[PDB]
């Protein structure tokens, strides 16, 4: 009957739901302060509260929308779908949870939007020349990955300001390379040239039309260019139903956030688009560089993968930046850039080998635990991702959505999406902690029989100044009567020490360092045994001084674990199969075995007196292992009969025993037959 909420939720209909998923509470005077309250649904149900007055909400896992996952990227009309659930309805109760799953496929033939963002520093003039054959060739090789690929183009040459640019010391650097019998272009920060197009032959021509500029400061403006290419969807030509590949091609180290201080650039980068009608970054002289933080958030939020097509001698910085820009990839570029075709095809294949989920707008009170199915039906806990996938393969994530306490009565949208994917799961989450009869309540002073109080969930509830079992003994004074069962067995305390009986219920006057709950002031939130300066070492919660252990802990002080890896032996058996596990350690078995797993046993009757027991049952149907029906699993040794126990010359133990039939049987116990235990039992005892 009396279980948890018996003492913890009786004072409040919201509290009983706050306290435990098993509790219910009747209304409409079904059990008009009969005796038990809250308890378990089933106890009230049996004690005349079977009708739906019980106010017993349950948690639920429902799917609002499940458009089926698609096999092919070109399969337009119905939107090509990359994940299975689309919209999910989640209903929680306090300290409860529900499971769901996320199926994600690396859909085959999925369209590709690729932008070629080029380093336009003078060392690249021969690259622009080599690249004259790309676009056409890049797309051609990519036709195998997908039938639909678009190619765009842009460039960067660093911020056109005093310390980066040759400062325009003279006029001569307004249109540079006058220094070396040639001509080249001025510095522009970031430029956009070609939006993404299916007419990829346009790239061949657009790159031939370009030429390089001069940079004094070796570090590149590549981070502004990446961020703008990443952010400016409207010009870059990113279509949401496509993978976005930003290819960054360069021969040099990048310039980063707050380095811009040298040019008087101190304005924070807000991660916004600043490219105007001239397809030019107008912020190139006023805004600083984006941080690794900003790049990561914007490319993740908008599903842009970055490919670093970087020459060999600077790879160390790009690889290290990618570690701090998750989801990106870095390859090695040839000095003539002829391998961009291959670099990109492999970079794409690498990008599509990882499935990773991110949850947007997740509230502080909810915890989403993941177990990721990386292979077959095996799941690894603590993972938002799986590695080693091919295009056309799937990944399956198991998610547990748990809520702590009782968060506010608002509907929140948890967006669970693979990174780089447009499709996402919207989980719509609400919290059922109220009783319907909590809202359907009209306190109104009167109605609590003859009195002044409140009313909820089918019963009256007089507050301070009126209290009583129903409506009486405001501050005692009608109290020196009625007695009542204020304590078990009528042992006559006023109320279990910390409290006093008040007209059928006790009132706890204590208000120091915690709370007291229950009819007889039974539950002390603050009073239990410390293990090392803390109640039960922080490995459980207390209720009435009784500590309720957490997962994988036991004992009064919750310091005895139920974890067994520390008492497990090298053979996979707890206590090596000969001993008892206790508090993460091992209790010695009678023959005299010793050590953490009973590894050593110098006294132990030789194995022959333990192995005969197996032979005696597996072959002769006698012994403890026969009577206990245990030999078949206990003895995993191979036992063979032989006509003769031969001079093997190897590690064979000569064992012997006299049986129930007054016969003497000899056998040999041989160790390490390619890791197996082999017994040779004479056919003729």
């Amino acid at each position, epitope marked *: 009957g009396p279980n948890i909420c018996t003492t913890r939720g009786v004072s409040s209909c919201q509290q009983c739901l706050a306290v435990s998923p098993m509790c219910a509470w009747c209304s409409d005077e079904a059990l008009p302060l009969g005796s038990p309250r809250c308890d378990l649904k089933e106890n009230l149900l049996k004690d005349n509260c079977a009708p739906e007055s019980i106010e017993f909400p349950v948690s639920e896992a429902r799917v609002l929308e499940d458009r089926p996952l698609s096999d092919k990227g070109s399969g337009d009309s119905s939107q090509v779908t990359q994940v299975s659930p689309q919209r999910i309805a989640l209903r929680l109760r306090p300290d409860d949870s529900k499971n769901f799953s996320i199926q994600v496929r690396q859909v085959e033939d999925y369209p590709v939007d690729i932008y070629y963002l080029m380093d336009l520093s003078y060392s690249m003039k021969d690259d622009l020349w080599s690249i004259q054959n790309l676009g056409t060739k890049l797309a051609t090789q990519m036709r195998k990955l997908t039938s639909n690929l678009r190619i765009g183009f842009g460039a960067f040459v660093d911020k056109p300001v005093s310390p980066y640019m040759y400062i325009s010391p*003279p*006029e*001569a650097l307004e249109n540079p390379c006058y*220094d070396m*019998k040639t*001509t080249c272009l001025p510095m522009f920060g970031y430029k956009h040239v070609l939006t993404l197009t299916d007419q990829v032959t346009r790239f061949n021509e657009e790159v031939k039309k370009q030429s390089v500029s001069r940079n004094r400061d070796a570090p590149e403006g590549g981070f502004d260019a990446i961020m703008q290419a990443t952010v400016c969807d409207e010009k870059i030509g990113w279509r949401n139903d496509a993978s976005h590949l930003l290819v960054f091609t360069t021969d040099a180290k990048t310039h980063i956030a707050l380095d811009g201080r040298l040019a008087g650039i101190v304005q924070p980068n807000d991660g916004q688009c600043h490219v105007g009608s001239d397809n030019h970054y107008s912020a190139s002289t006023t805004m600083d560089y984006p941080s690794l933080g900003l790049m990561t958030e914007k490319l993740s939020q908008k599903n842009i993968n970055l490919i670093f097509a970087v020459t060999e001698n600077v790879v160390n910085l790009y690889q290290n930046y990618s570690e701090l820009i998750p989801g990106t990839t870095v390859g090695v570029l040839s000095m003539d850039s002829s391998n961009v075709l291959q670099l990109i095809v492999d970079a794409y294949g690498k990008i599509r080998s990882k499935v990773e989920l991110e949850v947007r707008d997740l509230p502080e009170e909810l915890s989403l635990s993941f177990n990721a199915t990386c292979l077959n039906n095996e799941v690894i806990p603590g993972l938002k991702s799986c590695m080693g996938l091919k295009i056309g393969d799937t990944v399956s994530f198991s998610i547990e959505a748990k809520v702590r306490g009782c968060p506010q009565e608002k509907e929140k949208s948890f967006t669970i999406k693979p990174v780089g994917f447009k499709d996402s799961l919207i989980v719509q989450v609400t919290f059922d902690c109220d009783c319907a009869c909590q809202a359907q309540a009209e306190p109104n002073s009167h109605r609590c029989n003859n009195g002044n109080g409140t009313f909820e969930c089918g019963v009256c509830r007089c507050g301070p100044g009126w209290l009583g079992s129903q409506c009486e003994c405001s501050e005692e004074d009608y109290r020196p009567s009625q007695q009542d069962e204020c304590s078990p067995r009528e042992g006559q305390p006023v109320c279990s020490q910390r409290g006093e009986c008040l007209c059928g219920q006790c009132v706890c006057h204590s208000s120091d360092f915690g709370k007291i709950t229950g009819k007889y002031c039974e539950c002390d939130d603050f009073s239990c045994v410390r293990y090392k300066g803390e109640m039960c070492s922080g490995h459980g919660q207390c209720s009435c001084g009784d500590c309720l252990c957490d997962s994988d802990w036991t004992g009064y002080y919750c310091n005895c674990t139920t974890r067994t890896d520390t008492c497990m032996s090298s053979n996979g058996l707890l206590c090596s199969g000969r001993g008892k596990c206790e508090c993460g350690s091992c209790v010695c078995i009678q023959p005299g075995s010793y050590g953490d797993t009973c590894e050593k046993c110098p006294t132990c009757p030789d194995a022959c007196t333990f192995k005969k027991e197996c032979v005696e049952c597996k072959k002769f149907d006698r012994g403890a292992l026969h009577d206990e029906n245990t030999c078949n699993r206990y003895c995993r040794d191979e036992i063979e009969s032989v006509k003769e126990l031969k001079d093997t010359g190897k590690d064979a133990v000569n064992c012997t025993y006299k049986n129930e039939d007054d016969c003497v049987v000899r056998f040999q116990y041989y160790e390490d037959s390619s890791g197996k235990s082999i017994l040779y039992v004479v056919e003729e005892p």
Partner: antibody, heavy 117, light 107 residues
């Protein structure tokens, strides 16, 4: 103080050749670009050729290219212009000049070249 | 590239002010210089890079302009200002000079 002195001008028969020199002192000769600019009888100035500070890059007027060579000896602090296949159009006062980022900041006194039969 | 320079000749009474104008067929940013040439003497840089004067050149000489149109103004012309003036472009190969202006002093 910058000192520039050109020499070697004179009368050359058409189709001929002639080498002009320009000595320099008072400055770090190898730290600056050098140019030859000529003043045609109409008093028009025309840039002829440029040699970079280290001598690596050499630029010529299109109607001069393939006939003239500009060179320098940074140890001898002397600039040269070796002309060949000379025409009447090449008659002019030749001036060597020191650069300041595209400008000709300092000029010589001039050496007169006459191309005539 | 063609550098057009006007006026070709100029007669200025001492104390009066004048200006010369340089026109480039394309944009030459600020890559335009001005020179002065007196009789039996070589050209001298007056103004470099459209408006930057030099070191011992009077403030009376002030250059201005960008791209395609540049000026050289001379406030209160002195007797010693007589002589030829030239603009020169350093943007694109070959470098080019304007036709030149002959400044004469009225007396």
């Amino acid at each position: 103080e910058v000192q520039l002195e050109e020499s070697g001008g004179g009368l050359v028969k058409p189709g001929g050749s002639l080498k002009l020199s320009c000595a320099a002192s008072g400055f770090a000769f190898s730290s600056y670009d050098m140019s030859w600019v000529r003043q045609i009888p109409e008093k028009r100035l025309e840039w002829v050729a440029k040699v970079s500070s280290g001598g690596g890059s050499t630029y010529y007027l299109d109607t001069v290219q393939g006939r003239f060579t500009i060179s320098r000896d940074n140890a001898k602090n002397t600039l040269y212009l070796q002309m060949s296949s000379l025409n009447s159009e090449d008659t002019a006062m030749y001036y060597c000049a020191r650069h300041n980022y595209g400008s000709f900041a300092y000029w010589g006194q001039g050496t007169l070249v006459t191309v005539s039969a | 590239l063609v550098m057009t320079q006007t006026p070709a000749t100029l007669s200025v009474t001492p104390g009066d002010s004048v200006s010369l104008s340089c026109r480039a067929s394309q944009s030459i940013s600020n890559h335009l210089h001005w020179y002065q040439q007196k009789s039996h003497e070589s050209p001298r840089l007056l103004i470099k890079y459209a408006s930057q004067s030099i070191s011992g050149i009077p403030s009376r000489f002030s250059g201005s302009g960008s791209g395609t149109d540049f000026t050289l103004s001379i406030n209160s012309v002195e007797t010693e200002d007589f002589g030829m003036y030239f603009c020169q472009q350093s943007n694109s190969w070959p470098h080019t000079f304007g036709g030149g202006t002959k400044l004469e002093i009225k007396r």
